Amino acid sequence: PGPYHFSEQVGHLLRRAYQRHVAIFQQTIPDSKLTAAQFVVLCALRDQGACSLVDVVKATAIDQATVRGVIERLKARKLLAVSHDPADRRKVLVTLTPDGRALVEEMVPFAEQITQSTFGGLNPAERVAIVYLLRKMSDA
Amino acid sequence: GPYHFSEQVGHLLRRAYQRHVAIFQQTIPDSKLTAAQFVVLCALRDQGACSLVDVVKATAIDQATVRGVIERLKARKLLAVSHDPADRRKVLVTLTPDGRALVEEMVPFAEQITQSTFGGLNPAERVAIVYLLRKMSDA
Numbered sequence A: 001p002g003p004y005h006f007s008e009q010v011g012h013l014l015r016r017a018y019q020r021h022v023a024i025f026q027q028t029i030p031d032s033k034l035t036a037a038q039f040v041v042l043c044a045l046r047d048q049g050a051c052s053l054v055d056v057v058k059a060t061a062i063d064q065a066t067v068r069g070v071i072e073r074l075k076a077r078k079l080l081a082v083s084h085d086p087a088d089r090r091k092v093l094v095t096l097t098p099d100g101r102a103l104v105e106e107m108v109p110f111a112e113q114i115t116q117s118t119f120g121g122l123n124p125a126e127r128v129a130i131v132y133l134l135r136k137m138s139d140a
Numbered sequence B: 001g002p003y004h005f006s007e008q009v010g011h012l013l014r015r016a017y018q019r020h021v022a023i024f025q026q027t028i029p030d031s032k033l034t035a036a037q038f039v040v041l042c043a044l045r046d047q048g049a050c051s052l053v054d055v056v057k058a059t060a061i062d063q064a065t066v067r068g069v070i071e072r073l074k075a076r077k078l079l080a081v082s083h084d085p086a087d088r089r090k091v092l093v094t095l096t097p098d099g100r101a102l103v104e105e106m107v108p109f110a111e112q113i114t115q116s117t118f119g120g121l122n123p124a125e126r127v128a129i130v131y132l133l134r135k136m137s138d139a
Ligand SMILES: O=C(O)c1ccc(O)nc1
Pocket: A006, A009, A011, A012, A015, B024, B035, B036, B039, B059, B060, B110, B113, B114
C-alpha cells in the first residue's frame, strides 16, 4: 500500500479547499458586514419566505445552535423578524425584512464573484464535476 | 442569474467538510486526538525533526494554530521541544515513543475515515474528487 500520507486523503483536500474558499469569501465580502452564515440564513429566508428554525436548519445545513445565534445577531440588526407560528403560538417563525432583502440583494453579486474566484481555473466540465461530487458525497 | 446558495461550490465544500469532520470525530474521539493534533504528529513521523516552518508547510495549518497544537501536545507528552544548537530563534519538535504509538494506533482508523468520507462515490468519482480538490487549491 505504502505509507499513510494525510496530504493525499480526501479529508485533507476538503479542509484545504474549504479554507481557501473561506479566505476568498472573507477577502471579497468583509466579515464585518455579513458572515457566510448570516448571508446564507438571510438568503434562505428570502427563498422560502417565512421559515421556522427547523426549516432554516434543513435548508441551511447549519446546526440548530449556530442558526439560533445567527438569528439573534440578525434580528438585532432588523435584518430579520421573529413572529409567532400561525399554527403553534408557542413556536418561532422567522421572516425577512426590507433591510434584510436589501442587504441580500446588495451582496449577491459579490457571492457570485466569490463562486467564480473559488472555482479558479476549472473548466466548465470540472466545475460541474466538483459541484456534483460534493453534493453526492454529502448523503448517506 | 438567480442566486441559489444551495448549489454554490462554497456551500457544498462546507457541507462536505463538516460531514467528514463529523465522521472523523465519530471514529477518533476528541479525548484521544483532534484531527489537527493527529496531522501534526503524522508530520513529525513522516519528516523527522521539524521546525515550525516545516510543520506548517507539511500540515497546512496556520503557524499560530500550529503553535497552539504543539503546546497542547507537549503538555500531553506526545512530542518534545528541543532547541536547535544552530540557532536560538529556532524551535525543534520531535516525536516521542507515546506519540509514535498513538500515530500508528490511529492510522488504520484515519484510513477508515477517508474511506467512509468517500461514501457512495465509485472509483472514478473518487479519483475526480481528489483531482478537483487538489487542482482547485492551486491558483
Ligand atoms: O488536514 C486535515 O485537517 C485532515 C487530514 C486528514 C483527515 O482525514 N482529516 C483532516
